[PDB]
């Protein structure tokens, strides 16, 4: 069996312990969507720029964008999860007190 109980947990007020996917991703603040967007840019820009030499600018840009999507999305997920769970600043408790 599994349990999301954590070490050093709940340092901030938890909003929803063990957030379900499609909710923790629907919790993306305009900062997360701005972290998932800058990582995908620095990963497309490096991916295209690295590929200027071997002639692969387009496809290396695409694979840098794939890496950036995966990484920046897992980072936005880390943030919105440690926010929904009690791990991060978590000023999005108004979303629970209002809904």
């Amino acid at each position: 069996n599994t349990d999301i109980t954590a070490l050093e947990k709940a340092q901030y007020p938890v909003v929803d312990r063990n957030p379900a996917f499609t909710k923790v991703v629907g919790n993306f603040s305009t900062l997360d969507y701005l972290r998932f967007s800058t990582i995908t840019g620095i990963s497309v820009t490096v991916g295209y720029l690295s590929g200027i030499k071997p002639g692969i600018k387009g496809p290396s840009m695409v694979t840098g964008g794939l890496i950036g999507l995966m990484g920046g999305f897992m980072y936005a997920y880390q943030n919105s999860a440690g926010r929904l769970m009690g791990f991060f600043p978590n000023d999005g408790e108004v979303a629970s007190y209002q809904k």
């Binding site: 900062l31 800058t38 840019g41 620095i42 820009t45 295209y48 600018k57 840009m61």
Partner: peptide, 27 residues
């Protein structure tokens, strides 16, 4: 009146990455 296809995408991406850096401090 434009450069090679794909160079434009990288130039746009750099602005969106730089916007994110100022934004990360802002938000």
């Amino acid at each position: 009146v434009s450069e090679d296809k794909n160079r434009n995408y990288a130039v746009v991406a750099g602005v969106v990455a730089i916007v994110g850096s100022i934004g990360w401090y802002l938000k």
